[PDB]
CSV table of C-alpha atoms and ligand atoms in Angstrom, one decimal:
chain,number,residue,atom,x,y,z
D,37,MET,CA,137.2,95.4,84.4
D,38,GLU,CA,136.3,93.6,81.2
D,39,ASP,CA,137.8,90.5,82.9
D,40,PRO,CA,135.1,88.0,84.1
D,41,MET,CA,137.8,86.1,86.1
D,42,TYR,CA,138.7,89.2,88.1
D,43,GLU,CA,135.0,90.2,88.5
D,44,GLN,CA,134.2,86.7,89.7
D,45,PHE,CA,137.0,86.8,92.3
D,46,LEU,CA,136.0,90.3,93.4
D,47,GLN,CA,132.4,89.3,93.9
D,48,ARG,CA,133.5,86.3,96.0
D,49,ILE,CA,135.8,88.5,98.1
D,50,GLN,CA,133.0,91.1,98.6
D,51,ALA,CA,130.7,88.4,99.9
D,52,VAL,CA,133.0,86.1,102.0
D,53,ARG,CA,132.5,86.2,105.7
D,54,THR,CA,134.3,83.1,107.1
D,55,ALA,CA,137.9,81.9,107.2
D,56,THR,CA,137.3,78.5,105.5
D,57,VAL,CA,135.6,80.1,102.5
D,58,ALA,CA,138.3,82.8,102.4
D,59,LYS,CA,141.0,80.1,102.3
D,60,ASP,CA,139.4,78.6,99.2
D,61,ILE,CA,139.3,82.0,97.5
D,62,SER,CA,143.0,82.4,98.3
D,63,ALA,CA,143.9,79.0,96.8
D,64,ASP,CA,141.7,79.6,93.7
D,65,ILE,CA,143.4,83.0,93.1
D,66,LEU,CA,146.8,81.3,93.3
D,67,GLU,CA,145.7,78.6,90.9
D,68,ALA,CA,144.2,81.2,88.5
D,69,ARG,CA,147.6,82.9,88.5
D,70,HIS,CA,149.3,79.6,87.7
D,71,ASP,CA,146.8,78.9,84.9
D,72,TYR,CA,147.4,82.4,83.4
D,73,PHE,CA,151.1,81.8,83.3
D,74,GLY,CA,150.6,78.4,81.6
D,75,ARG,CA,148.4,79.9,78.9
D,76,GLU,CA,150.9,82.8,78.2
D,77,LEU,CA,153.8,80.4,78.2
D,78,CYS,CA,152.3,77.9,75.8
D,79,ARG,CA,151.1,80.6,73.4
D,80,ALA,CA,154.6,82.1,73.4
D,81,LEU,CA,156.3,78.8,72.8
D,82,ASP,CA,153.7,77.8,70.1
D,83,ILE,CA,153.0,74.5,72.0
D,84,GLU,CA,149.5,73.1,72.7
D,85,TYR,CA,148.0,74.4,75.9
D,86,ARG,CA,147.0,71.8,78.5
D,87,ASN,CA,146.4,72.0,82.2
D,88,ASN,CA,146.8,68.7,84.1
D,89,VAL,CA,147.2,65.6,81.9
D,90,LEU,CA,147.0,62.2,83.8
D,91,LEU,CA,150.3,60.4,83.3
D,92,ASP,CA,148.4,57.4,82.0
D,93,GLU,CA,146.9,59.7,79.3
D,94,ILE,CA,150.4,61.0,78.4
D,95,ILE,CA,151.8,57.5,77.9
D,96,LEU,CA,148.7,56.4,75.8
D,97,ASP,CA,149.1,59.5,73.6
D,98,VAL,CA,152.9,58.9,73.1
D,99,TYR,CA,152.8,55.1,72.9
D,100,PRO,CA,149.3,54.1,71.8
D,101,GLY,CA,150.0,50.4,71.7
D,102,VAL,CA,151.0,50.1,75.4
D,103,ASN,CA,149.4,47.8,77.9
D,104,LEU,CA,149.4,50.2,80.9
D,105,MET,CA,148.5,47.3,83.1
D,106,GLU,CA,151.9,45.8,82.7
D,107,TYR,CA,153.5,48.8,84.4
D,108,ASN,CA,153.1,50.5,87.8
D,109,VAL,CA,152.0,54.0,86.6
D,110,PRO,CA,151.8,56.7,89.3
D,111,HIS,CA,148.6,58.7,88.7
D,112,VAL,CA,150.3,62.1,88.9
D,113,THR,CA,149.0,64.9,86.6
D,114,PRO,CA,151.7,67.2,85.3
D,115,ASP,CA,150.4,70.5,83.7
D,116,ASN,CA,151.5,69.6,80.2
D,117,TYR,CA,154.1,67.7,78.1
D,118,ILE,CA,155.9,68.0,74.8
D,119,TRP,CA,156.5,64.8,72.7
D,120,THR,CA,159.3,65.5,70.2
D,121,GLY,CA,159.3,62.1,68.5
D,122,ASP,CA,162.4,61.0,70.3
D,123,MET,CA,161.8,62.5,73.7
D,124,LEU,CA,159.0,63.3,76.2
D,125,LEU,CA,159.3,66.6,78.1
D,126,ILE,CA,157.1,66.5,81.2
D,127,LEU,CA,156.1,70.2,81.8
D,128,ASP,CA,155.0,71.8,85.1
D,129,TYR,CA,154.4,75.5,85.4
D,130,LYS,CA,155.1,77.4,88.6
D,131,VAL,CA,154.4,80.9,89.8
D,132,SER,CA,156.4,81.7,92.9
D,133,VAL,CA,159.0,84.1,94.2
D,134,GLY,CA,160.8,81.1,95.7
D,135,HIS,CA,162.4,77.8,94.8
D,136,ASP,CA,160.7,75.6,97.3
D,137,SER,CA,157.7,74.4,95.3
D,138,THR,CA,160.1,73.7,92.3
D,139,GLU,CA,162.2,71.4,94.5
D,140,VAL,CA,159.2,69.5,95.9
D,141,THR,CA,157.9,69.0,92.4
D,142,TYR,CA,161.3,68.2,90.8
D,143,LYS,CA,161.9,65.5,93.5
D,144,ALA,CA,158.4,64.0,93.2
D,145,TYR,CA,158.3,63.8,89.4
D,146,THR,CA,161.9,62.6,89.1
D,147,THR,CA,161.5,59.7,91.5
D,148,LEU,CA,157.9,58.9,90.5
D,149,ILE,CA,157.9,59.4,86.7
D,150,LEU,CA,161.4,58.6,85.5
D,151,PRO,CA,161.5,54.9,86.7
D,152,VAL,CA,158.3,53.8,84.9
D,153,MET,CA,159.3,55.7,81.8
D,154,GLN,CA,162.7,53.9,81.6
D,155,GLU,CA,160.7,50.6,81.9
D,156,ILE,CA,158.4,51.5,79.0
D,157,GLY,CA,161.4,52.8,77.0
D,158,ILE,CA,160.4,56.5,76.6
D,159,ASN,CA,163.2,59.0,76.9
D,160,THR,CA,161.8,61.6,79.4
D,161,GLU,CA,162.9,64.8,81.0
D,162,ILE,CA,161.4,66.6,83.9
D,163,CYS,CA,160.8,70.3,83.0
D,164,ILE,CA,159.8,73.0,85.5
D,165,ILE,CA,159.2,76.5,84.2
D,166,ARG,CA,158.8,79.2,86.9
D,167,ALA,CA,157.7,82.8,86.6
D,168,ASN,CA,158.5,85.1,89.5
D,169,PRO,CA,155.2,87.0,89.9
D,170,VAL,CA,156.9,90.1,91.3
D,171,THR,CA,159.7,90.4,88.8
D,172,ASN,CA,158.3,88.5,85.8
D,173,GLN,CA,161.6,86.7,85.3
D,174,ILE,CA,161.4,83.1,84.1
D,175,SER,CA,163.5,80.2,85.4
D,176,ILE,CA,163.8,76.8,83.7
D,177,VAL,CA,164.8,73.4,84.9
D,178,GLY,CA,165.3,71.0,82.0
D,179,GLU,CA,168.3,70.8,79.7
D,180,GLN,CA,166.4,69.6,76.6
D,181,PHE,CA,163.7,72.2,77.2
D,182,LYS,CA,166.3,75.0,77.4
D,183,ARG,CA,167.9,73.8,74.1
D,184,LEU,CA,164.5,73.8,72.3
D,185,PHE,CA,163.5,77.2,73.8
D,186,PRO,CA,166.6,79.3,74.5
D,187,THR,CA,164.4,82.3,75.4
D,188,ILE,CA,160.8,82.6,76.5
D,189,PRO,CA,159.2,85.7,74.8
D,190,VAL,CA,156.2,86.2,77.2
D,191,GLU,CA,154.9,89.5,78.4
D,192,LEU,CA,153.5,88.8,81.9
D,193,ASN,CA,151.6,91.1,84.3
D,194,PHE,CA,150.5,89.5,87.6
D,195,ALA,CA,149.3,92.8,89.2
D,196,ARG,CA,145.6,91.9,89.2
D,197,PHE,CA,146.2,88.6,91.0
D,198,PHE,CA,148.2,90.5,93.6
D,199,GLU,CA,145.3,93.1,93.9
D,200,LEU,CA,142.6,90.5,94.5
D,201,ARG,CA,144.6,88.5,97.0
D,202,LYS,CA,145.7,91.6,98.9
D,203,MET,CA,142.0,92.6,99.3
D,204,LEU,CA,141.2,89.1,100.7
D,205,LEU,CA,144.1,89.3,103.1
D,206,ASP,CA,143.2,92.8,104.2
D,207,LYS,CA,139.6,91.7,104.8
D,208,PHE,CA,140.9,88.9,107.1
D,209,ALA,CA,144.0,90.6,108.6
D,210,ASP,CA,142.6,90.1,112.1
D,211,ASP,CA,141.3,86.5,111.6
D,212,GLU,CA,143.9,84.2,113.2
D,213,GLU,CA,142.3,81.1,111.8
D,214,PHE,CA,142.5,82.4,108.3
D,215,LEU,CA,146.1,83.5,108.8
D,216,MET,CA,147.0,80.0,110.0
D,217,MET,CA,145.2,78.4,107.0
D,218,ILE,CA,147.3,80.4,104.4
D,219,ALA,CA,150.5,80.3,106.4
R,1,MN,MN1,148.8,71.3,87.7
R,2,MN,MN1,152.4,73.3,88.4
């Protein structure tokens, strides 16, 4: 495994003995899987890769002569964004076999981001790009995003994230407190 990320996770899983440390390994693996999808997606779309940009930072980058202090800016941190010149695409990457996390984030970003951006006068769209880690299929929320990128030519393989997390869960298959933490 010429993969230091995998080796690092494997060493943590070899060593872990308690449920609270195992829960942090689990959450880290899920985040590493999300970050892997983000890197592959941005490279495939030839857009600059970022991971968590404070909304205040996004506004400052798009509208440099803004007085943030005039507006009520929620301090959310979407994964990335595209500024087209006329429109701001707020980008969030998901890796999930389900829709639930997309709905939670769509509702949050729609109700929190869109009002202040209409105040400032920046045309904004909420974009969520989801990879199914089992099937590799990509789902997109975002009309303008879909028009810009009618296909997403990524080659994904999530198997190693599945392998690591399955080891952790097998190691703690009889630990009720761990199972409740990841439930
Ligand atoms: Mn994020
Ligand atoms: Mn995300």
